[PDB]
Amino acid sequence: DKTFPIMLNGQVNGYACVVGGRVFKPLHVEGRIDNEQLAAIKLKKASIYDLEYGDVPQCMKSDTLQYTSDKPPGFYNWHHGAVQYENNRFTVPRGVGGKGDSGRPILDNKGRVVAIVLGGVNEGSRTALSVVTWNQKGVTVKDTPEGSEPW
Amino acid sequence: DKTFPIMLNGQVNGYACVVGGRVFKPLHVEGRIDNEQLAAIKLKKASIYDLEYGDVPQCMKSDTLQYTSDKPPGFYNWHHGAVQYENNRFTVPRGVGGKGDSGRPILDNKGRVVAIVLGGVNEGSRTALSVVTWNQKGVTVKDTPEGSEPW
């Protein structure tokens, strides 16, 4: 995958993934993008989903396909781990989920983008993440667990 | 198959397809057909649906069988390559998409016509084709991409 990151004062603060139809960048994290071809994309504020407007040129758009709703309880790959659950997120091994590394998509076996992470730093021995998703009919619904912390 | 070129001062500036029941020829092109039995065709103008008068008799009828709706997203036999999608045209690579080759049919695995190209010289790194499609029961739909120049 080719998801360009957000650089704030030398280090990283988030990952602004590129999905066909709408480029995603969480407004919870800050910093400037460093792609000069994507630097002219208009920064448009949106709702509590922390969404950036998709003014992507069409030929380098839809390079990353996106999984629809009715997602199974099957096996998914996280970029530093693995998760297996349908309604909420499964237990993840600890250590991952620190600070300033959110926005990385949760993929599937076919490589389609299923979900975009927003939180999930630490929630005990079993780690559950606050993550936007598609519920049943294409409704783009965010979901946080109890006592969640932004990432 | 059986598709005809349109002559304009000795050079090719379009391709005319024939389907069982009615012939086809794009509106944006002009010239003379390359057949004596197609020289008596009553030419007429139409809307962007690209409707021509198929007044050919029984002598060369039943040339290309029409493909119905419920088209699968699989392989399709383009003349200069292959197209693999249903909702819109698959991103064909560069090089193809020149000029003067309008109206070329996109065939199937069983030699059945399913769409007729109209435009899209260049979109950038990829190339989207504006074709005519049949939506759900056989109603012909003209589908176009953003800013597609006729071709």
Catalytic residues of A: 28, 50, 102
* Planar angle of CA A77, A78, A79, nearest 5 degrees: 115
Task: Count the helices and strands in chain A (H runs, E runs).
Answer: 0, 11
* Interface test mutation site (partner A, options B92, B123, B126, B146, max chain A beta carbons within 10 A): B126
Resolution (A): 3.4
B143 vs A108: CA distance, rounded Å: 31
Q: Residue A38 has which token pair?
A: 């994507």
Three-state SS for A129?
A: coil
The Cα of B126 is separated from the nearest Cα of chain A by a number of Å equal to 5
Q: Residue A58 has which token pair?
A: 């069409």
Q: How far separated are the first and last CA of chain B, in Å rounded?
A: 21
Neighbours of A134 (CB within 10 A): 17
Looking up tokens 């602004």 gives A16
Q: Exposure of B16 by Cβ count < 10 A (0-12 exposed, 13-18 middle, 19+ buried)?
A: buried
Q: Residue B90 has which token pair?
A: 């698959």
Q: Exposure of B39 by Cβ count < 10 A (0-12 exposed, 13-18 middle, 19+ buried)?
A: exposed
Q: Which of 48-77 (A) contact B at CB < 8 A?
A: 57-60
Please enumerate in sequence order all residues whose Cβ is within 8 A of that of B2, keeping only pairs 6 or more positions apart, or say none.
B18, B60, B63, B64
B46 vs B124: CA distance, rounded Å: 31
How was this structure determined? It was done by cryo-EM
Amino acid at A13: N
A94 vs A126: CA distance, rounded Å: 8
**Closest by alpha carbon to A26, among A97, A101, A83, A81?**
A101
Q: The dihedral of CA A111, A112, A118, A120: what is its sign?
A: negative
The Cα of A60 is separated from the nearest Cα of chain B by a number of Å equal to 7
A43 vs A145: CA distance, rounded Å: 29
Neighbours of A133 (CB within 10 A): 20
Catalytic residues of B: 28, 50, 102
- Please give the torsion angle defined by the CA atoms of residues A76, A78, A81 and A84, in that order, rounded to the nearest 10 degrees: -30
b (16+ CB within 10 A) / e for A93-130: eeeebeebbbbbbbbbeeeebbbbbbbbbebeeebbbb
**Closest by alpha carbon to B132, among B74, B91, B71?**
B71
Q: Residue A109 has which token pair?
A: 């076996």
B9 close to A (CB below 8 A): no
CA distance to A56, A63, A86, A111, B67, per residue, from A133 (Å): 22, 20, 10, 16, 38
Q: Residue A5 has which token pair?
A: 């990151």
DSSP string, B72-140: -SS-B--TTS-B--SSS---B-SS---SS-TT-EE--TTSEE-EEEEE-S--SSSB--EEEEE-SSS-E
The Cα of A59 is separated from the nearest Cα of chain B by a number of Å equal to 5
* Residues composing chain B: 151
Asked if A59 and B146 come within 8 Å (Cβ–Cβ), the reply is: no
Please enumerate in sequence order all residues whose Cβ is within 8 A of that of A134, keeping only pairs 6 or more positions apart, or say none.
A67, A68, A69, A71, A114, A115, A140, A141
